[PDB]
Amino acid sequence: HSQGTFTSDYSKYLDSRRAQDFVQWLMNT
């Protein structure tokens, strides 16, 4: 309903940025 699941749309994306963020440690030249 009303409260319907927008929340779980985003709180995922941030599981992609700290995954791209890792890619700097195992790298950053």
UniProtKB/Swiss-Prot annotation:
Residues modified to Phosphoserine: S2
Domain of life of the native organism: Eukaryota
Function of the molecule: Plays a key role in glucose metabolism and homeostasis. Regulates blood glucose by increasing gluconeogenesis and decreasing glycolysis. A counterregulatory hormone of insulin, raises plasma glucose levels in response to insulin-induced hypoglycemia. Plays an important role in initiating and maintaining hyperglycemic conditions in diabetes.
Protein name: Glucagon
Organism: Sus scrofa (Pig)
